[PDB]
Amino acid sequence: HPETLVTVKDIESRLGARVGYAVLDTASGKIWESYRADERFPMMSTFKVLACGALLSRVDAGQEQLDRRIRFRQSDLVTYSPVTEKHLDDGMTLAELCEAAITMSDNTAGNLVLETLGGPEGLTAFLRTLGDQVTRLDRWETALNEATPGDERDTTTPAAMAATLRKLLTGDALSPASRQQLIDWMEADKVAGPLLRSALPAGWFIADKSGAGGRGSRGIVAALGPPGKPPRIVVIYLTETEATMDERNAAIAEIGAALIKHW
């Protein structure tokens, strides 16, 4: 849509950033709008949706139990672990860890979920079973946020991420209760206030997950739409900028506002 392209090109000029996005209609399976959709961007914490989807896939296959309790130590804590650092003595269930990784973006929680999958290599192998030949996780938290330009480790493309999220969130990669559990966690996202949610019309559905990383990287993945209607997958990444957090937040929100205005 010409509206959105005006917005994104202004962001790229104002902030000096590389911006990419894709909007995928889940009812039709068609890309509704996109920009740099085949370019790579760092996933940052948006990988956590994929990690929890992979865990739920193992649950569905009888290989894993959501109420299994994980015990961990202070030595497992990485930067920004607001939930996991409270449970060094009693541990956490896998459901609680997924909830922490998605709703709070807890970094140790993300690592502990990854561990159940066989690490970044195991998550990448799960993505290949979904037909995603592009997305790759290579490192753990917090090194995966480094976002060195030209480094393809820990990246996706907006088109690849949108297609993979469709399969997880509205497709049949997961059982209906498991798919709804992933949606529930994403609906409960506590750390994406100033992004797509700031543009969302009253009463609309949104399930999302944000990310922030090195070299000004910022991003969000989401399913959103009017209530009771098939949603669209929205993927927005930006990187390589000196822009402030406030400016990067506003950029993503302005793209969302343009998408909403002509939904």
Residue numbers in the entry: 26 to 238, 240 to 252, 254 to 290
Give sentences copied directly from the paper behind this entry.
The TEM-1 β-lactamase model system has been extensively used to study protein evolution. β-lactamases are a class of enzymes that are produced by bacteria in order to provide resistance to bactericidal β-lactam antibiotics through hydrolysis of their core β-lactam ring. We apply EVcouplings to computationally design variants of the model protein TEM-1 β-lactamase. To examine the structural effects of these mutations, we obtained X-ray crystal structures of designs 80.a, 80.b, and 70.a. Aligning these structures in 3D to a published WT TEM-1 structure (PDB: 1XPB34) revealed that all three have nearly identical Cα backbones to WT TEM-1 (0.26–0.61 Å RMSD over all Cα atoms).
We also searched for local structural changes by examining differences in all pairwise distances between residues, which showed small changes in a one looped region for all three structures (positions 255–257) and in a second loop of 70.a (positions 53–55). Both 80.a and 80.b have 55 amino acid substitutions relative to WT TEM-1, of which 80.a has 15 mutations in the core of the structure and 80.b has 19 in the core. The 80.a and 80.b designs also had a 4-fold increased MIC of aztreonam, as well as a 16-fold increased MIC of ceftazidime. The two designs that were optimized solely for predicted fitness (i.e., distance unconstrained) both conferred resistance to ampicillin, with the greedy optimized sequence (opt.a) having a MIC equal to WT TEM-1, and the parallel tempering optimized sequence (opt.b) had a large decrease in MIC (roughly 100X less). In summary, nearly all of the designs were able to confer resistance to ampicillin including a design with 84 mutations relative to its closest natural homolog (70.a) and two designs with over 50 mutations (80.a and 80.b). Most of the rest of the distance-constrained designs (98.a, 98.b, 95.a, 95.b, and 80.b), which all had more than an 11 °C increased melting temperature, also had increased activity on at least one of the four tested β-lactams. To investigate the structural basis for the increased Tm (80.a had a 24 °C increase relative to WT TEM-1, 80.b had a 18 °C increase, and 70.a had a 6.3 °C increase), we tallied the total number of hydrogen bonds and the number of atom pairs in contact (1.7–4 Å) in each structure. However, we did observe literature-reported globally stabilizing mutations such as M182T in every one of the designed sequences, which has been shown to confer a 7.5 °C increase in Tm as a single substitution. The 70.a, 80.a and 80.b designs also showed increased resistance to aztreonam (80.a and 80.b had a 4-fold increased MIC, and 70.a had a 32-fold increase MIC, see broth microdilution assay in Figs. 4, 5). There are five shared mutations near the active site that are in three designs (M69A, E104T, P167T, E168A, E240G) that may contribute to this increased resistance.
